[PDB]
Amino acid sequence: ARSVRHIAIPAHRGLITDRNGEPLAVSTPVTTLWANPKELMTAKERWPQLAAALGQDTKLFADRIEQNAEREFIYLVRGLTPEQGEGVIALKVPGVYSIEEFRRFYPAGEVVAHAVGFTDVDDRGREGIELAFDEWLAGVPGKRQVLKDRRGRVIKDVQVTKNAKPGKTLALSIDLRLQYLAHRELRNALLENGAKAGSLVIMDVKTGEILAMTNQPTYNPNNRRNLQPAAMRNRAMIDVFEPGSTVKPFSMSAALASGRWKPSDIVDVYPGTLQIGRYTIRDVSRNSRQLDLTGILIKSSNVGISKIAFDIGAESIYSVMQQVGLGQDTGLGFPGERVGNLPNHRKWPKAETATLAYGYGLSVTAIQLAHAYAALANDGKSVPLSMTRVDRVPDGVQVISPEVASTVQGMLQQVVEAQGGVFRAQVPGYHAAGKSGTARAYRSLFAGFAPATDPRIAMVVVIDEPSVSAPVFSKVMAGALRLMNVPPDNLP
Ligand SMILES: *C(=O)[C@@H](NC(=O)Cc1cccs1)[C@@H]1NC(C(=O)O)=C(/C=C/c2ccc([N+](=O)[O-])cc2[N+](=O)[O-])CS1
């Protein structure tokens, strides 16, 4: 005669904004439609009109209901515009009930899909920040006490057992303005250079905040009809790649810290090749004998960096790379994030020392490389990575000594000004610094920070299988510094 079950009360799921309160993920009211089959079986004359008004086949609908005859409840349609749901309600069919419900909407859409992520039909995070802060955002579902009837008639509620608690607002470190800039210029380059996938990260070197993270290809999380698993891949967090020549600045920092190297010291790279048993280190352009250390970067000499590494040892280079976070957990707690590989030897071989010095044998994510570069721009100080707005900045760790870090910044500044600039990479108005890298078709890498005299932004551009990165960097950096009203530092 009487039965007491418990239908839960959906919590309003917390708003996600960028730095500036711009909505990135919003709980939209919608309407589900369910029905008591036992109620529906007393109204079989009504089913064809209900099927029709649900776009479901008359005889399939009937079958669906017949074979759920003894079951108390089923879902008709989830997530109609409340009016669409209201029209179905007008039909006033016995047994057809509604529940109001929240469905997430993503106003920035594809622009920031990998960072924000998306929910599943339960309104429960299943990628990105939506999944990473699902606690914070979800809030406590309330519960209803009510009275059963012979086939599912609700009579009343005994008491409000649980008031539903809303989830909490979440403001990201992303600046949707810089995010849009990066999204756009990255996508142009992919097309302009005939390339397959991309990534671009922008970090605030002072606060640890990720200002922008974008990837190509990307998807529209509002329209997930055809899945395309490659498009949803948040590469900046997930693709480990080998970083190549963009770790030569940390090799160099190890050298300048050893006590044995200053930038005007000389290495002989004649003839542009070097052997270790069967392994042969090749430079890309081999018309050099003596180079100074700024020159080994400007001429992108693998032989020169390996010769410095042999003198100082791989252990020193490994230690600098580990202190900046290469191949180390970032603590972001983002879903399926990859740690990467930093190889360790008790006795490093000459071949293994050479490859590590020039970026091979280790694998990193773009977030790690950006973070390492941010540690270089802030003068050797690593502020912890953050994907949420940082109003009170945590203390940073000194991982490279400031004189050495300041010295490395200058060499990188000379890398952009004398050669590695004039065709691409010079950021107009500000002194920029950075290092290019080429990873096998190949993968095009560029990492750097700006402005050179009070560094603010660190940036990584990763572009795969092109038919390169330095313009993407130069353009995105230019606009990013302007969006932040960073006064130019290239002055008379
Ligand atoms: C660091 O990664 C070094 N590269 C290698 O040792 C591995 C190589 C990949 C392909 C060739 S060698 C140095 N880094 C750089 C760099 O700083 O970008 C280069 C650049 C060489 C390069 C690559 C591709 C093309 N291209 O038009 O396709 C042209 C050049 N190039 O300018 O000669 C490699 S050495």
Swiss-Prot record:
Its EC number is 3.4.16.4. Pfam families: PBP_dimer, Transpeptidase. It comes from the Bacteria. Disulfide bonds: none annotated. One of its GO terms (cellular component) is plasma membrane. Keywords: Carboxypeptidase, Cell cycle, Cell division, Cell inner membrane, Cell membrane, Cell shape, Cell wall biogenesis/degradation, Hydrolase, Membrane, Peptidoglycan synthesis, Protease, Septation, Transmembrane, Transmembrane helix. It is a single-pass membrane protein. It is found in: Cell inner membrane. The keyword Lipid biosynthesis does not apply. Pathway: Cell wall biogenesis; peptidoglycan biosynthesis. InterPro entries: Bact_Transpept/Beta-Lactamase, Beta-lactam/transpept-like, FtsI_transpept, PBP_dimer, PBP_dimer_sf, PCN-bd_Tpept. It catalyses: Preferential cleavage: (Ac)2-L-Lys-D-Ala-|-D-Ala. Also transpeptidation of peptidyl-alanyl moieties that are N-acyl substituents of D-alanine. GO terms for biological process: cell wall organization; division septum assembly; FtsZ-dependent cytokinesis; peptidoglycan biosynthetic process; proteolysis; regulation of cell shape. GO terms for molecular function: penicillin binding; peptidoglycan glycosyltransferase activity; serine-type D-Ala-D-Ala carboxypeptidase activity. Induction: Mainly produced during exponential phase of growth. The keyword Iron does not apply. The active site is at 245 (acyl-ester intermediate). Belongs to the transpeptidase family. FtsI subfamily. Catalyzes cross-linking of the peptidoglycan cell wall at the division septum. Binds penicillin. This is Peptidoglycan D,D-transpeptidase FtsI. The lineage of its organism: Bacteria, Pseudomonadati, Pseudomonadota, Gammaproteobacteria, Pseudomonadales. The gene is ftsI.
